Amino acid sequence: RHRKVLRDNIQGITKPAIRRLARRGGVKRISGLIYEETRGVLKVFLENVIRDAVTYTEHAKRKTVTAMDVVYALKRQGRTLYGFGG
Amino acid sequence: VLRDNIQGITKPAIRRLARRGGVKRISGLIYEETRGVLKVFLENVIRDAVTYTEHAKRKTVTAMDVVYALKRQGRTLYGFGG
Amino acid sequence: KARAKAKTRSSRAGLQFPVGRVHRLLRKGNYSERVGAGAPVYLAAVLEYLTAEILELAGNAARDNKKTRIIPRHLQLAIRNDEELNKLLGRVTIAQGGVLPNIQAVLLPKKTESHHK
Amino acid sequence: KARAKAKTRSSRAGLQFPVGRVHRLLRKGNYSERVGAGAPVYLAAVLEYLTAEILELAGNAARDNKKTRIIPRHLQLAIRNDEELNKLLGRVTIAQGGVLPNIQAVLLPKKTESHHK
Amino acid sequence: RSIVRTLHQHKLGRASWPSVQQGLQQSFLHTLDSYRILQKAAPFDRRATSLAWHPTHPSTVAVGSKGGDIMLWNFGIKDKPTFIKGIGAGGSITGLKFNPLNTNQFYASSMEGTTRLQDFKGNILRVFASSDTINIWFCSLDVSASSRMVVTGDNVGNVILLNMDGKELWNLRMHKKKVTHVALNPCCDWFLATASVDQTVKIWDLRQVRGKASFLYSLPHRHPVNAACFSPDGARLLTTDQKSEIRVYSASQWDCPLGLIPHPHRHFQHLTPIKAAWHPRYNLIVVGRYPDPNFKSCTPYELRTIDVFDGNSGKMMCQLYDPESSGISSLNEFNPMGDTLASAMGYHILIWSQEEARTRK
Amino acid sequence: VKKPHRYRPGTVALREIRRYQKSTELLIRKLPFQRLVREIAQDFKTDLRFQSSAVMALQEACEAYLVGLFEDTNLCAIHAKRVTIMPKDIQLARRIRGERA
Amino acid sequence: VKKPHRYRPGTVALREIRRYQKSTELLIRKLPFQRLVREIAQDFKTDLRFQSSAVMALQEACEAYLVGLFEDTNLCAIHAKRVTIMPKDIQLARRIRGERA
Amino acid sequence: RKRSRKESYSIYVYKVLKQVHPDTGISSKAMGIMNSFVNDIFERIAGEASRLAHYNKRSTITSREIQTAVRLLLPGELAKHAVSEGTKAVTKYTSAK
Amino acid sequence: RKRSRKESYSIYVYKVLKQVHPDTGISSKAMGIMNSFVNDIFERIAGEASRLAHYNKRSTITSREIQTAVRLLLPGELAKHAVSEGTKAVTKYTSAK
DNA sequence: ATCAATATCCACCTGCAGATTCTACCAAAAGTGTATTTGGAAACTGCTCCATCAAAAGGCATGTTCAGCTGGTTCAGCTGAACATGCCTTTTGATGGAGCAGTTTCCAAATACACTTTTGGTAGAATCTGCAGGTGGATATTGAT
DNA sequence: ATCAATATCCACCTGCAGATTCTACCAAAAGTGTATTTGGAAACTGCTCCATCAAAAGGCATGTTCAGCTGAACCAGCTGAACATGCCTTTTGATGAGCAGTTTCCAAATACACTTTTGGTAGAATCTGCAGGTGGATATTGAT
């Protein structure tokens, strides 16, 4: 079926999930339009990280995106992630 | 009051730097704050440069020293070698 | 003729970290053509001191929460409540780290209740 | 004894940037134990292309100002007007460069000005 | 287009049998779109694994469950279909086939590692093979009444050949991995085609090949092969791979394939391997569809449907799809008469027959 | 008494803030994030496989980044004499940090 | 001519903005900066000399960083329905970037 | 009398400038900026290539490694043209061994 | 003869933990975090030392180089204590010869 | 009976700081060889990744109420931008000294390399036990009277 | 202000899912013995920087002043918050095959020693944009 839950995409991040993330950050009251911009920013960030990871995996001639690939991709941009290897 | 050489960064000079940055109206208290910010930044850069020159057994803070000091802070500088 | 009993370089320096391992990683890794004798011991000592500081703060945080085991959260609190460590690791994310419970003051309910009509 | 007329590896590749010099700088620098033959050629070509792009944009900037010599100001305009290069050099300060003209709209005054008396 | 004009044109003898067959097949496709209704369905415990048609009876269908349950389901009788409970852990009936002599029995290959002859009433007659050892099981099964031979494959790549009374002279390893399908040709009774996960199909002649895996030919495949089924006339070999490809090989130059039919039937651990089947009295191929995001589908609708192609032209001719059964139809086997189609969806068995003929008084 | 207990606007917001700052459980569900990541992976290469740990790493990093951005945004909102975060706050935060917007 | 030509507030400021954005000569004076740099150096270590190029580099880096901070401060100021830069704006700009130090 | 020999990329930058704009000159300070730019990009690409080599447990920096480094550092359409230019350069060099 | 061997800093971190807090335990994820921390700081200091050796045309990394790297990287009072620990360790090592 | 201080902006002209081009020298780069080494292709294998159908348990998408935030509209008052003045700190020159940043040369601690002996992490089992999840109460929050 | 629904703080009590704690061993570490470099002492030159003098002269510290901005105070209107409830959507346990992760080889590749010669540059002669100085010529923003 053509389910495509509101986009089959970033629109799958339910509004309560963005509310939960904002609350973890200390946000008390949220405007209506914040959700779409949050989805856009998430999409851009994910695109960049995944592009770096996919380049890494393609260089080694692998059909898997290893966790260390994501770790090194994040380290490239300066968001080192501790707890998955180094 | 003691000049402290931080007043050497005159108010008109702060106005000029702010003007080049796109501002139009300066509140009075901006001058002391900008003097403090510049002091902190200069302290950091000079500390790194002095560490570099000390490690080389020198007494002159070379231009390459300050350029390398700026590299660490992520403020790469072009024009004085590299 | 003698072959004195092998004594570890860690014991000589009184460090719990492996001096030989740091030497080996320095040679393999191409940091410089030659590695001096005293560099590995110094580097191992630095690593040991930093690890000790982080673990001490983590254990204090754990005791604060009435837990005997250090889970990833307790490392996050230790790193984020100490200025120098927070600066050394200011651009790092801890798996299952969480955040400090900081809440901005203005958001808190306004207890400044005064004369009202 | 043959001693074929020496042709620079730059000429063989049809490049203006030196290929031997990059190979030397790669060997000395501890970038890796071994450097392949094709690496210096590729790197020299990449550097040449980037230099060509920036210089072409700077020259275009100079012609717009009726100036025939590229001064440091022009390179700033070339880098900070092209989005891709700005991304490449977003964390670099050019000596004696200045800043691009930019005035926020809120600052510009009311536009009411025309002969009315 | 000339729906009725061709049969009379034949009747004068101007048309040969093949043209008549083509016309009758066209009629079959034309009526197939009225079959869309699902006349009956039935549940039982776990995923369905095996489908076998009663060789003679045109309403009896046998289906096995992944847990070792066997169900005899004669449509229209409401006789509380016979059900045999199984272990439920590894009793999966990987292959079910009626005993051609006595239809009340069946040859069932099970994950237990026991290809057995069992009466539908429940009592087990005789076990043909049992390799024991747990990480050795039986996956394939085929029986030829003409020569009274029974063939069964193993998980490692060693196939066995037994008479209907025993005395196997076989167990020579022919593949480096699991042997998925073995098919004994109907027309002849001596040459056998076997498909395996080795990504190769080997054709044998059991009456003449005994010399250390002496094969007539090797059919390379790009991906693992699930099934290698012969046309009822035995002149064509239909081979189904695991990612997306269907190949038909003729008796002439076995090696080269007649046509490559793209079709998405990707593999899954928890899905009964998809098998294309031959239409008993036409040149049609029936196989389910398993949508793929990466597969090339030009149509705007990507639905799970039972596709029907033509053996020679290799083009789609009809599709079956009825919402309320949008599951994946792993298996699809036609009724011997060619009127009813039985499908094995997960946990549901589907029959695509139609109503009867004119009514009496 | 017949009137039903109704919490005033806000007294649940702070409670949620405390609850979700005192915890560490991932907030974005596994399946939607997995689908999103795989969809974005199609544009760069076809027939890619993601280790479960790789997707977990991506989720952790994305949630951390969003939490940081929301903190900076809320800080911007206060500076405007407001309690509600609006899109222009996100845009200013991103502009100051160095990202495109 | 009761009063001389008196430009209204803002116009001279805009003209100065244009003039100092079209130029590239250093805005900080040379000798004061030299003396300040030497004071900081003597704080960190005694009897140190400086190459003229090194002091030039310090001047360039400081001016560039300050102008960047002023751009961000102005961006923050406009956000607050204002045209004036105040210390709170510098504080916010430094905080968002991560320059708390 | 005594003086070292500084090595720079000045002459080659001048050659490229002459190629793209024959009737144009470059100041000494602009030449300094260009030298710094070339050196910085050299260091960036070489470092990323070295990391790519060590990460795959390899000890030789081949053309593939520099290709990946360029793909990773540069943005947008700049990567495409640069990779094409490098590929042409290596193809020409190897075709005339 | 296959035998995987994944080298790690778990045992040493555990020894230090017992030394500084005998009645405390560490989770596997916590131990992974500490492993990553140790590797990260090692890379930082070693790379800074390598860079320093290059600037001064020095072909070796000695205790002075690590000391300068530590002074550059670590902030605040953590630099003083770390350098004091390093000096004490090196003097103890040499005095044992 | 909107033009005037100041600006901007163009047109032209001249000399020199400062780029360009040109001698010469010689340090690296090629070229020709001989020696290591090691990247990618077979080969295998054991962990783990792909993603359906029931079944189920929770979140959540959708609709009311409605409290309170929030842009907007007036309004003081304050305050900083503009301008006029006279001192005065900062630029251009200097002229030496001279401190020491580079540049040679020498050799003795220092480290590499290499083997050969030794034992310390590490991959598996064994088993030990924090604490996650329940179960209950006691208290504080919060709220409309 | 009592009070009246929750939430959160507690506080015992299991049991099991990970952590500690035993092994064997083999790969990496440590101990001698040569080779071979660094780099650091010790002695230079002469280059750059400290100062310290003139003289401006350009900038700034310095007071009026008043025009626009910044902050109050209400205010209406709406929009996010909160609960209520069915209905999705996510979560999860059933007993195949792909491919990441190691071994092991060469043929190809790169490295390592001398040699030849040549682009690289030290610095020196030239050219020559354009910085700077006159002059108009408009042009903008602010006063009837």
Side-chain angles (χ1 to χ4, degrees), chain D residues 9 12-18 21-22 24-26 31-39 41-43 45-56 59-60 63 68-72 75 84-85 87-89 92 94-96, chain H residues 7-9 12-13 15-17 19-21 23-27 29-30 33-34 37-38 40-47 50 59-63 66-67 70 74-75 77-78 81-83 85-87 89-90 92-93 96-97:
Chain D
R9 304 131 72 81
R12 271 171 224 248
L15 297 186
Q16 303 262 74
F17 274 53
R21 179 166 293 181
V22 162
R24 166 172 64 89
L25 290 195
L26 274 165
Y31 290 105
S32 85
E33 278 111 321
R34 297 158 91 73
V35 170
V41 181
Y42 197 113
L43 196 48
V46 172
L47 293 163
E48 193 225 348
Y49 164 64
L50 283 152
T51 300
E53 190 73 19
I54 208 75
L55 274 170
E56 157 175 49
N60 291 357
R63 195 151 31 61
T68 168
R69 213 192 290 292
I70 293 162
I71 52 151
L75 287 163
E84 289 87 13
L85 270 156
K87 208 81 85 56
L88 180 69
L89 311 172
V92 184
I94 297 278
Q96 225 148 325
Chain H
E7 317 281 20
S8 34
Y9 294 114
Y12 313 101
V13 167
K15 287 179 186 182
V16 172
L17 171 53
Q19 263 201 327
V20 290
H21 286 279
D23 58 322
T24 294
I26 191 177
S27 196
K29 265 172 271 283
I33 285 157
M34 299 305 308
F37 174 89
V38 169
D40 175 25
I41 286 311
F42 191 115
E43 261 174 50
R44 273 201 230 189
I45 283 161
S50 147
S59 35
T60 279
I61 279 157
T62 36
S63 266
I66 303 288
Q67 184 117 0
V70 173
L74 274 70
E77 86 291 358
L78 263 179
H81 303 308
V83 160
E85 241 305 347
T87 46
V90 61
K92 206 190 313 307
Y93 170 84
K97 266 191 179 72

Side-chain angles (χ1 to χ4, degrees), chain B residues 20-60:
Chain B
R20 179 179 280 180
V23 305
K24 187 184 160 193
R25 224 162 170 285
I26 315 292
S27 155
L29 322 194
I30 274 279
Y31 305 123
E32 220 67 359
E33 196 102 23
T34 178
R35 275 149 183 161
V37 174
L38 174 64
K39 196 218 179 49
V40 175
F41 182 84
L42 253 178
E43 251 169 343
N44 279 318
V45 175
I46 276 156
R47 176 158 59 216
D48 301 319
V50 173
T51 300
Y52 274 118
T53 192
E54 260 179 13
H55 176 267
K57 314 302 311 313
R58 271 195 332 255
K59 292 183 59 41
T60 289

